[PDB]
Amino acid sequence: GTLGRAIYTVGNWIRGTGQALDRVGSLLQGSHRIEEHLSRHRTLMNVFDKSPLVDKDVFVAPSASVIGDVQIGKGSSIWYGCVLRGDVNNISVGSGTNIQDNTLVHVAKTNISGKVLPTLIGDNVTVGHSAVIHGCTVEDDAFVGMGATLLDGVVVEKHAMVAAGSLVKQNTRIPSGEVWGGNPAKFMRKLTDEEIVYISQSAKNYINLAQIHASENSKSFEQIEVERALRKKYARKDEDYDSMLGITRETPPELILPDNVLPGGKPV
Amino acid sequence: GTLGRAFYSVGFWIRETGQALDRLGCRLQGKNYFREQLSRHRTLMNVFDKAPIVDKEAFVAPSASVIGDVHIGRGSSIWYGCVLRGDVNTVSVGSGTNIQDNSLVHVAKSNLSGKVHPTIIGDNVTIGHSAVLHGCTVEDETFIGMGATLLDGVVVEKHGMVAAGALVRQNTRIPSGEVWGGNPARFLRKLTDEEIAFISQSATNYSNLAQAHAAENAKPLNVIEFEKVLRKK
C-alpha cells in the first residue's frame, strides 16, 4: 500500500541516480567505448521478395543466418554459426539432412560457369563442421566431412563420402561408394558396409540430437529462470540427510534428457 | 597513453557503481529483468582507443565481428560471420573489396613469433569464403580463393589469384598474373584475360549485392516478432 508506493518511489530515485552515475562514468571514459545495443541479427531474412520456407520441425539455431530463397525439409537442422545465403539463386535442403556448426552453404551467381544450377542437398545427408558449399548437388544419403570444400559444379552421388579437409575441384563427380578426399580430392578407397551404417546412424543421431537444442533455444525468460533455479537446487545431493528425513529428492523432468541421446540409452 | 588508461579504468569503476545502483533500484521495485541473458556481441568493438573506422557506404553484417584498429573503405563489405580482429596492429581494408561469408582476417596475437605485420587489403580485392588472412598483404584487383590460408609475410601482387584451399607459406610472394594453389602453394598456371574480366566484374556484383543486403538489414526491427517472443506459453 502506502509503504509499497514509498518503496517504489525510492527505487525510482535510486535508478535515476544510478543511471546518472553510469552516464558520468561513460563521460570520464572519453566516449571511446562502443555501447552494446539490441541484437540486430535476423535468423531468417529476405533479400529480393524471397522468403525462406523453413519447415515446422526444423531446428534453426538463433546464431544461424538463413537468408534469401532457402527451402528446408522436415526433420533437418541448421546449427550454430551456419550461413545459408540463397540470395542470388535457390538453395534446397532435403528432409532429415543436418548442416553442422559454422558451415556455409552459398549458391553461385547463376553465371559463374554459364550453366550454373542451384545448390541442392538431398535427404538424410550430413555436412561436417566448417564445411564450405558453393554450388554443389549433393545427392541423398551422402556424407561430407568437416572442413571439406565443395566447389561449384560438383555432384556427390548417393552413398558416397568426402573426406574431412578435402577440396573437390569444380565439375568433379564422386561416384557411389567412394571416399574421395585430399586437397586434389582424388580416389582414396571404397566404402565398406560398416561405413554406410555409420553414415545412416550419424544422420539419425543428429536428427535425434537437434530436438533438445531446439527445445532449449526457444525458451522464454520466465522458463529460463525457473530451470536455472532448479539446476542450482539439484546440482549437489545429500543422500544421508534425505534418509534421515525420510524423503527422496528426485530430479525434475525439466532437467532430464531423453534416453535416446545418452551414450547407450541409460534409463537410470 | 598511460594517462588515458587510468581515466578509462576509473570510468569503468564509476559505470559499474552506477549499474549496481540501477540494479538495486530495480530490486526494490520487484523487477528482475536485468537477469535476462542478452547477447553482448558488438559488430564494432574497440580495445581502449583502438576503435574500428567504417565508412558510411560500407555493409557490415550484424553477425560480423570487427575489433580493434580496422579501417573499411567506401564500397567495401564485410559479410556474415566474418571476424576482423586487428588489435596489436592495424587491419586496413580498401574500397570495393568484399570479405565474404565466414572469412577471417586477423593479425598475430603475440610478438614472440617476431614483428606483427599489419594486414593490408587493396581495392577491388575478392576474399573467398572461409579464407584466413593472417597478417599478410594483398595488392588491389586481386583474388583470394575459397578456403585459402595466407600466412604472415605474404605479398600477393596486383592481378594475382590464389587458388581455392591453397595455403601460402610464410614470406611468399605471388607474382602478378599467376595462379598459386595446392598445399603448399605453388605456381600452377597463368591467368587469362577472361579470368581477369570476371575478377573485375565480381567486385562490382558483390558491391551491388551488399547495398541490397544493407537495405534489408537497415529496416526497423519487427515488433510482431518482439511481441511473440515476449509471450511464450
Binding site: 500500500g1 509503504l3 509499497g4 508506493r5 518503496i7 517504489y8 518511489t9 527505487g11 | 526494490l28 521495485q29 520487484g30
Partner: peptide, 30 residues
C-alpha cells in the same frame, strides 16, 4: 504499476533503512 507487492521484502527494506539510520545515529550521538 507504482506499487511494490512483496510485503516481506518491503519489511526487509524498512528494517535495513532503520538499521542504517540507527547505526548513523549511534555513531553520531555517541
Amino acid at each position: 504499476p507504482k506499487v511494490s507487492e512483496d510485503k516481506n521484502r518491503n519489511y526487509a527494506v524498512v528494517a535495513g533503512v532503520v538499521a542504517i539510520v540507527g547505526s548513523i545515529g549511534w555513531y553520531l550521538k555517541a
